[PDB]
Short mmCIF file of C-alpha atoms in Angstrom, two decimals:
data_model
loop_
_atom_site.label_atom_id
_atom_site.label_comp_id
_atom_site.label_asym_id
_atom_site.label_seq_id
_atom_site.Cartn_x
_atom_site.Cartn_y
_atom_site.Cartn_z
CA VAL A 5 -4.94 20.51 50.05
CA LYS A 6 -1.33 21.69 50.50
CA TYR A 7 1.33 19.02 50.21
CA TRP A 8 5.05 19.65 49.75
CA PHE A 9 7.72 17.78 47.84
CA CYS A 10 11.40 17.96 47.23
CA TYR A 11 13.43 17.39 44.08
CA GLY A 12 17.08 18.20 43.65
CA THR A 13 18.18 20.75 46.22
CA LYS A 14 14.77 22.43 46.50
CA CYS A 15 11.48 21.62 48.07
CA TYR A 16 8.10 22.78 46.87
CA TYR A 17 4.71 23.57 48.33
CA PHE A 18 1.83 22.92 46.00
CA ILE A 19 -1.13 24.78 47.41
CA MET A 20 -4.36 23.48 45.86
CA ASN A 21 -6.56 26.49 46.64
CA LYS A 22 -7.43 28.16 43.32
CA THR A 23 -7.03 31.91 44.17
CA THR A 24 -5.78 35.01 42.38
CA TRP A 25 -2.01 34.97 41.82
CA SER A 26 -1.55 37.34 44.77
CA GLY A 27 -2.79 34.33 46.66
CA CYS A 28 0.53 32.50 46.55
CA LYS A 29 2.54 35.28 48.04
CA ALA A 30 -0.09 35.54 50.77
CA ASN A 31 0.03 31.77 51.48
CA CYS A 32 3.68 31.15 50.63
CA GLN A 33 4.91 34.29 52.41
CA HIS A 34 2.74 33.08 55.30
CA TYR A 35 4.06 29.52 54.95
CA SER A 36 7.43 31.35 55.28
CA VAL A 37 8.46 30.07 51.82
CA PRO A 38 8.73 32.29 48.75
CA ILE A 39 6.42 31.57 45.87
CA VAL A 40 8.27 29.38 43.30
CA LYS A 41 11.13 30.46 41.03
CA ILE A 42 11.67 28.12 38.07
CA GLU A 43 15.43 28.39 37.84
CA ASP A 44 16.25 25.95 35.07
CA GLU A 45 14.99 23.51 32.48
CA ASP A 46 15.72 20.48 34.70
CA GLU A 47 13.33 22.05 37.21
CA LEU A 48 10.73 23.67 35.03
CA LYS A 49 9.98 20.36 33.45
CA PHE A 50 10.04 18.58 36.76
CA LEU A 51 7.13 20.58 38.03
CA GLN A 52 5.10 20.00 34.90
CA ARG A 53 6.00 16.26 34.84
CA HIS A 54 5.32 16.10 38.56
CA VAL A 55 2.40 18.48 38.86
CA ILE A 56 -1.23 17.38 38.40
CA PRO A 57 -2.73 18.62 35.07
CA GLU A 58 -3.77 22.15 36.02
CA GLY A 59 -3.19 25.94 36.15
CA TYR A 60 -0.25 26.54 38.46
CA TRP A 61 1.07 29.96 39.41
CA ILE A 62 4.81 30.70 39.76
CA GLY A 63 6.86 33.68 41.03
CA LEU A 64 6.98 35.36 37.63
CA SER A 65 4.95 38.62 37.36
CA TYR A 66 4.91 42.03 35.62
CA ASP A 67 6.50 45.08 37.23
CA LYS A 68 5.88 48.75 36.40
CA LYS A 69 8.98 50.21 38.05
CA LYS A 70 10.51 48.09 35.29
CA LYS A 71 9.21 47.47 31.81
CA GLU A 72 10.10 43.79 32.43
CA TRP A 73 8.97 40.59 34.18
CA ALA A 74 10.73 39.13 37.21
CA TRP A 75 10.61 36.58 40.02
CA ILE A 76 9.93 38.11 43.41
CA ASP A 77 13.55 37.30 44.03
CA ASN A 78 16.52 37.71 41.72
CA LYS A 82 18.06 33.23 37.07
CA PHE A 83 19.14 30.66 34.44
CA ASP A 84 16.02 30.70 32.14
CA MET A 85 14.20 33.16 29.86
CA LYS A 86 11.25 34.91 28.08
CA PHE A 92 6.52 37.43 24.86
CA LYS A 93 5.80 40.18 27.35
CA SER A 94 2.53 42.23 27.90
CA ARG A 95 1.32 42.39 31.42
CA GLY A 96 -0.33 40.23 34.09
CA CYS A 97 1.20 37.15 35.68
CA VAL A 98 2.25 33.70 34.45
CA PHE A 99 0.70 30.33 35.08
CA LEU A 100 2.44 26.97 34.86
CA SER A 101 0.71 24.00 33.21
CA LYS A 102 1.85 20.46 32.36
CA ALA A 103 2.30 21.84 28.84
CA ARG A 104 4.02 25.18 29.42
CA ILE A 105 4.07 28.42 31.42
CA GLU A 106 2.17 31.44 30.08
CA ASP A 107 0.78 34.85 31.14
CA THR A 108 -2.62 36.47 31.98
CA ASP A 109 -4.48 38.17 34.83
CA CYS A 110 -3.29 37.77 38.35
CA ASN A 111 -6.89 38.09 39.59
CA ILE A 112 -7.76 34.66 38.03
CA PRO A 113 -8.21 31.79 40.58
CA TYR A 114 -5.28 29.31 40.48
CA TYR A 115 -2.98 26.89 42.39
CA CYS A 116 0.38 27.74 43.89
CA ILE A 117 3.79 26.32 43.93
CA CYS A 118 6.02 27.89 46.50
CA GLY A 119 9.59 26.67 46.71
CA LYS A 120 12.45 27.14 49.15
CA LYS A 121 16.10 26.54 48.28
CA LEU A 122 18.15 24.13 50.39
CA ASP A 123 21.56 24.84 51.89
CA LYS A 124 21.92 21.91 54.26
CA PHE A 125 20.16 18.64 54.60
CA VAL B 5 32.80 12.64 45.80
CA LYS B 6 29.93 13.28 48.22
CA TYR B 7 26.91 15.03 46.68
CA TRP B 8 23.30 15.04 47.96
CA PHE B 9 19.81 15.09 46.57
CA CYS B 10 16.23 15.08 47.70
CA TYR B 11 13.33 13.12 46.22
CA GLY B 12 9.93 13.30 47.89
CA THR B 13 10.17 13.82 51.68
CA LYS B 14 13.56 12.10 51.76
CA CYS B 15 16.98 13.58 51.10
CA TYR B 16 19.91 11.34 50.24
CA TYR B 17 23.68 11.56 50.12
CA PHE B 18 25.66 9.65 47.58
CA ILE B 19 29.19 8.95 48.73
CA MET B 20 31.66 8.07 46.03
CA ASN B 21 34.26 6.31 48.08
CA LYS B 22 34.31 2.57 47.21
CA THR B 23 34.61 0.96 50.67
CA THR B 24 33.26 -1.98 52.68
CA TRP B 25 29.56 -1.80 53.47
CA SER B 26 30.60 -1.16 57.07
CA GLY B 27 31.94 1.92 55.40
CA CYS B 28 28.62 3.78 55.18
CA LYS B 29 28.14 3.00 58.82
CA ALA B 30 31.20 5.22 59.26
CA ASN B 31 30.53 7.70 56.43
CA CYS B 32 26.82 8.26 56.84
CA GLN B 33 27.02 8.33 60.62
CA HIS B 34 29.92 10.70 60.01
CA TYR B 35 27.42 12.76 58.04
CA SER B 36 24.69 12.32 60.67
CA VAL B 37 22.43 10.41 58.32
CA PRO B 38 21.54 6.71 58.55
CA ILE B 39 22.79 4.39 55.85
CA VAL B 40 19.87 4.46 53.37
CA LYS B 41 16.65 2.54 53.91
CA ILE B 42 14.72 1.87 50.73
CA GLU B 43 11.11 2.06 51.81
CA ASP B 44 9.73 1.06 48.34
CA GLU B 45 9.86 0.90 44.48
CA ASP B 46 8.78 4.47 43.84
CA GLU B 47 11.79 5.41 45.91
CA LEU B 48 13.93 2.40 44.97
CA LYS B 49 13.70 3.01 41.29
CA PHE B 50 14.47 6.71 41.77
CA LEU B 51 17.78 5.62 43.39
CA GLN B 52 18.59 3.14 40.67
CA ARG B 53 17.54 5.44 37.78
CA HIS B 54 19.13 8.50 39.42
CA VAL B 55 22.18 6.78 40.73
CA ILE B 56 25.08 6.57 38.26
CA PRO B 57 25.87 3.00 37.03
CA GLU B 58 27.65 1.55 40.01
CA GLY B 59 27.58 -0.71 43.04
CA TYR B 60 25.73 1.21 45.73
CA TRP B 61 25.23 -0.04 49.30
CA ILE B 62 21.87 0.24 51.06
CA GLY B 63 20.90 -0.18 54.71
CA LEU B 64 20.02 -3.83 54.26
CA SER B 65 22.18 -6.46 55.97
CA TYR B 66 22.27 -9.88 57.69
CA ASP B 67 21.72 -9.69 61.46
CA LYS B 68 22.69 -11.98 64.43
CA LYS B 69 19.74 -11.78 66.78
CA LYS B 70 17.83 -12.90 63.75
CA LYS B 71 18.27 -15.25 60.82
CA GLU B 72 16.79 -12.32 58.92
CA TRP B 73 17.89 -9.22 57.01
CA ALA B 74 17.14 -5.70 58.31
CA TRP B 75 18.18 -2.08 57.70
CA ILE B 76 17.77 -0.02 60.87
CA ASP B 77 14.03 -0.65 61.57
CA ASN B 78 11.39 -2.38 59.39
CA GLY B 79 9.14 -0.91 56.66
CA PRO B 80 6.88 -1.55 53.62
CA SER B 81 9.72 -3.77 52.61
CA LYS B 82 8.80 -7.25 51.65
CA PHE B 83 11.10 -8.92 49.28
CA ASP B 84 12.70 -12.01 50.72
CA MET B 85 13.36 -12.58 47.03
CA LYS B 86 16.82 -14.24 47.21
CA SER B 94 21.66 -16.62 52.74
CA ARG B 95 23.96 -13.77 54.13
CA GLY B 96 26.24 -10.73 53.73
CA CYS B 97 25.07 -7.36 52.58
CA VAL B 98 23.17 -6.01 49.58
CA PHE B 99 24.27 -3.56 46.91
CA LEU B 100 22.24 -1.47 44.47
CA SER B 101 22.82 -1.32 40.77
CA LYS B 102 20.80 0.59 38.11
CA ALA B 103 19.47 -2.91 37.51
CA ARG B 104 18.66 -4.18 40.97
CA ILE B 105 19.66 -4.83 44.57
CA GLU B 106 21.45 -8.03 45.54
CA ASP B 107 23.57 -9.55 48.35
CA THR B 108 27.22 -10.52 48.97
CA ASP B 109 30.22 -9.57 51.19
CA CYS B 110 30.21 -6.32 52.97
CA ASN B 111 34.02 -6.15 52.84
CA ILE B 112 33.70 -5.10 49.19
CA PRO B 113 34.82 -1.67 47.91
CA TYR B 114 31.46 0.03 47.13
CA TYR B 115 29.55 3.33 47.29
CA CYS B 116 27.18 4.76 49.90
CA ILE B 117 23.70 6.16 49.89
CA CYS B 118 22.85 7.87 53.12
CA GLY B 119 19.17 8.78 53.26
CA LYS B 120 17.30 10.72 55.97
CA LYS B 121 13.61 11.45 56.14
CA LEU B 122 12.09 14.81 56.50
CA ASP B 123 9.40 16.23 58.86
CA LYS B 124 9.27 19.81 57.75
CA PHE B 125 10.60 21.66 54.81
CA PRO B 126 13.38 23.94 56.35
#
């Protein structure tokens, strides 16, 4: 199951194939669309409100060449840090292992129509 | 004012230039998107709720080669709920009357991809 949907000026790809975080990139990158990047409250909530009650990955992960966390691509929204990767739920986002099987949410930005 | 948005697989355009219904014809075509065609409530509401409180046109209108009302084609439309003219959209509902009235447009294309 891999439907897509658009809200505001962005479209999303909700892969429903519970794999380790590094699974989105793989899919998403393959589906030529970056893994999601929750850019604002308006959005963040949209995904939860939209999304089906479950563990959803997002582009936020931990880097070593940086003590911080970041989206594959750099945002108007912010951060407790440790390590791992973050999942998005209908309740809130939150971290943990990237090797834990989950669902994706890629998302491309729109520039036209 | 001409901003756009996308809900579901459809992207819209909301023109803020109060003109005659035959105005979208011009505007939307000018923007390469059909005047909007409200396929259903899920969508309809989204337009009403999302749309700012105002009279907004929609692809629905009284045709010649018919006695009926159409948009561009024919879809999971149904409501022959209320004679002639054109129909506007308000945060409350849709409704008919003259097309020569200074209103706003809602162009709305469909999508087939993502890009």
